[PDB]
Amino acid sequence: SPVAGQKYDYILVGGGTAACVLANRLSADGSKRVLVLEAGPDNTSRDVKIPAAITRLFRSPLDWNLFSELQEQLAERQIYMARGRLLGGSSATNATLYHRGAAGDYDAWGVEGWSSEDVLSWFVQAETNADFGPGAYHGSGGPMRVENPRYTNKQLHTAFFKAAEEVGLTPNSDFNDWSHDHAGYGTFQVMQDKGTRADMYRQYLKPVLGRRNLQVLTGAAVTKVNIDQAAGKAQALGVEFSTDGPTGERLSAELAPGGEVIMCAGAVHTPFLLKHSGVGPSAELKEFGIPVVSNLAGVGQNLQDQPACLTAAPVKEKYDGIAISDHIYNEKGQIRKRAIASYLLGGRGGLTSTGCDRGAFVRTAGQALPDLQVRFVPGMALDPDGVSTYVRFAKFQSQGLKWPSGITMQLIACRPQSTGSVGLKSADPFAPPKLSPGYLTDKDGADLATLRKGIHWARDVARSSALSEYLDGELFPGSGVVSDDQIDEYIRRSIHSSNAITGTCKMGNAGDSSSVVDNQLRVHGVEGLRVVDASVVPKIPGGQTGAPVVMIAERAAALLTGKATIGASAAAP
Numbered sequence: 001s002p003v004a005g006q007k008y009d010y011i012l013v014g015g016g017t018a019a020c021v022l023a024n025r026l027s028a029d030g031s032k033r034v035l036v037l038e039a040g041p042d043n044t045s046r047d048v049k050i051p052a053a054i055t056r057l058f059r060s061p062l063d064w065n066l067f068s069e070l071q072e073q074l075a076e077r078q079i080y081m082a083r084g085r086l087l088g089g090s091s092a093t094n095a096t097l098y099h100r101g102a103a104g105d106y107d108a109w110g111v112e113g114w115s116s117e118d119v120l121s122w123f124v125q126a127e128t129n130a131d132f133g134p135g136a137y138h139g140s141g142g143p144m145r146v147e148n149p150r151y152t153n154k155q156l157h158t159a160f161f162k163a164a165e166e167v168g169l170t171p172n173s174d175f176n177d178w179s180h181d182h183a184g185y186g187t188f189q190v191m192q193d194k195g196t197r198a199d200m201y202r203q204y205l206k207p208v209l210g211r212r213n214l215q216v217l218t219g220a221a222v223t224k225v226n227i228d229q230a231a232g233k234a235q236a237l238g239v240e241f242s243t244d245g246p247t248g249e250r251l252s253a254e255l256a257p258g259g260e261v262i263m264c265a266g267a268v269h270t271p272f273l274l275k276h277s278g279v280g281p282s283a284e285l286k287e288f289g290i291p292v293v294s295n296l297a298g299v300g301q302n303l304q305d306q307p308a309c310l311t312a313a314p315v316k317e318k319y320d321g322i323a324i325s326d327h328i329y330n331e332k333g334q335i336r337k338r339a340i341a342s343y344l345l346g347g348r349g350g351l352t353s354t355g356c357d358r359g360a361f362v363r364t365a366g367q368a369l370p371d372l373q374v375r376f377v378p379g380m381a382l383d384p385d386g387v388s389t390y391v392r393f394a395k396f397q398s399q400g401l402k403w404p405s406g407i408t409m410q411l412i413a414c415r416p417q418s419t420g421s422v423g424l425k426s427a428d429p430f431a432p433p434k435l436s437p438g439y440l441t442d443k444d445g446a447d448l449a450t451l452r453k454g455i456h457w458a459r460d461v462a463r464s465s466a467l468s469e470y471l472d473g474e475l476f477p478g479s480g481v482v483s484d485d486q487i488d489e490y491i492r493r494s495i496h497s498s499n500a501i502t503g504t505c506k507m508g509n510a511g512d513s514s515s516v517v518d519n520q521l522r523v524h525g526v527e528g529l530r531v532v533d534a535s536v537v538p539k540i541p542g543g544q545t546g547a548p549v550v551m552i553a554e555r556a557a558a559l560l561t562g563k564a565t566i567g568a569s570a571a572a573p
């Protein structure tokens, strides 16, 4: 209906992080008609603009409210896996931490034309940094905004840093500078613009909505990619979607000649939609009577996510009032006047904080790269599940209760060895995917050992003089949890997502049989079909995954507009 009689040069499935970048770059020269189909609504929520309101986005209407299959290995629990559902996607609902990982993470992909030396200029191009000028590792005029956090907990941030120094960890002045080792303690930069969320809707899509060659539909749930097995090769024709949920008429947006469909539905929904389109393991598609168009083993495999557990400790009675929970709420759960004023006057104070923007990368045992990320929070978890405690914190407002003053250290396996999957539980394209995070399933128990040693590291830091000055015992995991076996069980019962999720449409070299796309991001076995989102990441980098997604989208846009090629190698004689 809004696409009737229209031909598009690019159809983007999803309007999330990658999609906002592509919509911007691909519509730039005015020659090409670009359609964006987002299932969620427009990006207008105040809860998206205010970083501390991440607490309100979990388990909300702007989230997919996805739960995993029962995990036998995690005390037989379903795991919540937060995913943004609106223009800007998960960039609109995330913790805003700005990480690229290490040069070694990209070289470890071993994909031609995607080495650390290939990707660096694409990170730098995207970047405007308020605290790092132009140099080998920072750009200055890109659409992203990155800055040092504009909240500082004067006692607790300083005490964390001195405690990490007291246990002998080195500082890292810039976690995105590849001229030095990834490990160390310091401050995570944030995708914020003077303390307001700088999501990829705000930075890439919203500024160009005036473009007549760009059409963005919200409330538009893609149901499958339309693919024709005519001439003698599967050819994308366009995309089926409903603007009215499961009962809506199935509409078809149509490609112009030379048109491509680009999957931008993210590492959960892209492989889900490809399988509904006949692209996936033939046995899984047959299960639900989906005709096999491209028998591709890798689709929905290689799901990598960074699992988390935490410690938490209260402060002494005399340090009551010093935590971020005290900066945001008073003792009745009323939002502090000082926090509102600081946010509106100059974009500072507790409302600019996602809480978890100071920390460390640590090697638990002589690894080539750090296996542990620590996120320090100058406030106290009231649940061993940190995402649950954030939902609790949002619900706490106006309850007339006082949130106890304390700290948390979240431990993340940032370069995990476990993999999971995403597939189908039904033929209905509106049903939730069959989602398996696969936490703690690696053959050697490496991810569990990372988190157990993480808890020992957090206890060493909390015991050090600088922090123990403020603290008064331990709430989580608590004095009941001391042996290696007790810690493992605490981890199984409390492990939660740190919200990465990559690798379900793995990019790979020619000859790599686990790959779903080539190094041009083309889906194997289909013409005019690409994936440009977190799905394509072969091997997850350490740290949060948003900045690598924007880098991949920037480079794909350059490839599709003819501004760049990918690979590299001189022809053999």
Ligand SMILES: Cc1cc2nc3c(=O)[nH]c(=O)nc-3n(C[C@H](O)[C@H](O)[C@H](O)COP(=O)(O)OP(=O)(O)OC[C@H]3O[C@@H](n4cnc5c(N)ncnc54)[C@H](O)[C@@H]3O)c2cc1C
Pocket: 013, 014, 015, 016, 017, 018, 019, 037, 038, 039, 040, 082, 083, 084, 085, 086, 087, 088, 089, 090, 091, 093, 094, 095, 096, 097, 098, 099, 220, 221, 222, 223, 264, 265, 266, 267, 269, 273, 498, 499, 500, 501, 532, 533, 534, 535, 544, 545, 546, 547, 549
């Ligand atoms: C709570 C949370 C915290 C995070 N913390 C951080 C952090 O601090 N820093 C960081 O860098 N990274 C963080 N991440 C990860 C980062 O946000 C993601 O890796 C990145 O945003 C993913 O980009 P994407 O384009 O691949 O997918 P998304 O941004 O998820 O975009 C996918 C889009 O597709 C849409 N979609 C799905 N199905 C359909 C359909 N059938 N039809 C139409 N549209 C559909 C979705 O609604 C969504 O808008 C976090 C993630 C979350 C969820």
Ligand SMILES: CCCCCCCCCCCCCCCCCC(=O)O
Pocket: 046, 049, 050, 052, 053, 055, 056, 196, 328, 335, 340, 344, 351, 393, 394
């Ligand atoms: C954890 C609780 C998070 C609280 C966040 C909501 C705080 C509400 C403050 C009152 C609204 C402030 C004025 C509106 C600011 C609108 C967002 C913006 O335009 O940047």
Ligand SMILES: CCCCCCCCCCCCCCCCCC(=O)O
Pocket: 052, 055, 094, 095, 310, 324, 325, 353, 354, 355, 356, 375, 377, 378, 379, 380, 381, 382, 385, 386, 387, 389, 390, 393, 408, 409, 410, 497, 498, 499
């Ligand atoms: C925004 C400030 C809220 C304060 C809440 C109290 C402190 C709790 C720390 C929670 C445990 C670790 C952080 C969990 C981070 C969840 C966000 C994310 O993963 O994207």
